[PDB]
Design goal:
Number of domains: 2
Function: Isomerase that catalyzes the conversion of deoxy-ribose 1-phosphate (dRib-1-P) and ribose 1-phosphate (Rib-1-P) to deoxy-ribose 5-phosphate (dRib-5-P) and ribose 5-phosphate (Rib-5-P), respectively.
CATH class of the largest domain: Alpha Beta
Main location: cytoplasm
Keywords: Cytoplasm, Isomerase, Manganese, Metal-binding
Number of strands: 13
Distance between the termini: 14 Å
Strand content: 15-25%
Structural class: alpha/beta
Subcellular location: Cytoplasm
Protein name: Phosphopentomutase
CATH topology of the largest domain: Alkaline Phosphatase, subunit A
Order of helices and strands: EHHHEHHEHEEHEEEHEHEHEHHHEEH
Bound molecules: manganese (II) ion
Helix content: 25-40%
């Protein structure tokens, strides 16, 4: 192995400008990092800049350096979706040609009729809601009738709530497996079905820990699967294990915040593993992009950048650090959805004694997966082209 350890960091949603196909996704004008930098009157990410961020693209406060520490370029998404699952699946060697559906006016009647027919229970609600709100609204009716509450969010989710005394947990889990099968159809294709059992009574309903999730498996064997199969470590930090439905994961390190995720990254630098340590930093997307909060996004980016020196100091000569994103989510764009953007790519090892250079633009995010696969001598993904031998 050329590198013993690869540390891969996805700054979730940290896009570096509208992609060539942004118009088809309603995303003309989008620029995540750029528009944050404008809002801040200069974004301050001095560690990312020394890696080469400004050499990718100069932005306010983000300037070129003569001798970047690592290699730098951007990557273009090939897959049809701009969601977190698609972007991550593509990073790890896949090509996804159907989108995950969302249902802002509720699920279509034909899907709900099928679910009612197969379960023998009637369905109520059928709208975007928070869990708390929909129980307050419909919990009593659900208890009294034995119906199922089906609700969704702005994300590709189908959630089914029922009182544990009224619909036994075993049946609720069977109902969700049925729903999971029905939602494999391309017209109804949802990212995750979630069992939402609750207890209590009107004015005091509680969602129980008996929640279970039925996520879609990645559409093919990933580079993570190949690493785990070949007896390497695959250390998933944060939402990574969920995004891949555990496929190829050997250790899952749960996190509660971006700073907790950088702590866990450091924990893995301190571990004697051979393989991949893979971090998702989700707060960028969930708290700043989706909430259209550019000031918050800028502060969060600055906080993240201030953690990098500690990472740099613990990298060894045969370690490689890769920093990228999975899509954009421009916090001044209309609506609340992701934005179809190029993503940055920085590749740094302290063995780069001459500093890095510009890499050719990556035509698919799967170039990351292909590089990781070539490094560890595992079977090459069907999509992507390695840049291992250019480092
Ligand atoms: Mn848009
Ligand atoms: Mn994402
Ligand atoms: Mn999102």
């Amino acid at each position: 192995n050329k590198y013993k350890r690869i540390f891969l960091v996805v700054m979730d949603s940290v896009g570096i400008g509208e992609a060539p196909d942004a118009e088809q996704f309603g995303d003309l004008g989008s620029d995540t990092i750029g528009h944050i930098a404008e809002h801040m009157n200069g974004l301050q990410m001095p560690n990312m800049v020394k890696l080469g961020l400004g050499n990718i693209r100069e932005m306010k406060g983000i300037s070129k350096v003569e001798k970047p520490l690592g290699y730098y370029t951007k990557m273009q998404e090939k897959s049809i979706g701009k969601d977190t699952m698609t972007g991550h699946w593509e990073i790890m060697g896949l090509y996804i040609d159907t989108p995950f559906q969302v249902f802002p006016e509720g699920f279509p009647k034909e899907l709900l009729d099928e679910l009612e027919e197969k379960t023998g229970r009637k369905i109520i609600g059928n709208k975007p809601a928070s869990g708390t709100e929909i129980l307050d609204e419909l919990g009593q009716e659900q208890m009294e009738t034995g119906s199922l509450i089906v609700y969704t969010s702005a994300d590709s989710l189908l959630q089914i709530a029922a009182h544990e005394e009224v619909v036994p947990l075993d049946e609720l889990y069977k109902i969700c497996k049925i729903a999971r099968e029905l939602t494999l159809d391309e017209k109804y294709k949802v990212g995750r079905v979630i069992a939402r059992p609750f207890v209590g009574e009107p004015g005091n309903f509680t969602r129980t820990p008996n929640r279970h999730d039925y996520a879609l498996k990645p559409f093919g064997r990933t580079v993570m699967n190949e690493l785990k199969d070949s007896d390497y470590d695959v250390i998933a930090i944060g939402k990574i294990s969920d995004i891949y439905d555990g496929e190829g994961v050997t250790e899952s390190l749960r996190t509660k915040s971006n700073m907790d995720g950088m702590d866990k990254l450091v924990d893995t630098l301190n571990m004697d593993f051979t393989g991949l340590s893979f971090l998702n930093l989700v707060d960028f997307d969930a708290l700043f992009g989706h909430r259209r909060d550019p000031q918050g996004y800028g502060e969060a980016l600055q906080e993240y950048d201030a953690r990098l020196p500690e990472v740099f100091a613990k990298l060894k000569e045969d370690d490689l650090l890769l920093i990228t994103a999975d899509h954009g989510n421009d916090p001044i764009h209309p609506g609340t959805d992701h934005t179809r953007e190029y993503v940055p790519l920085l590749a740094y090892s302290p063995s780069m004694k001459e500093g890095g250079q510009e890499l050719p633009l990556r035509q698919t995010f799967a170039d990351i997966g292909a590089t990781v696969a070539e490094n560890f001598g595992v079977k090459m993904p069907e999509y992507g082209t390695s840049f291992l031998n250019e480092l």
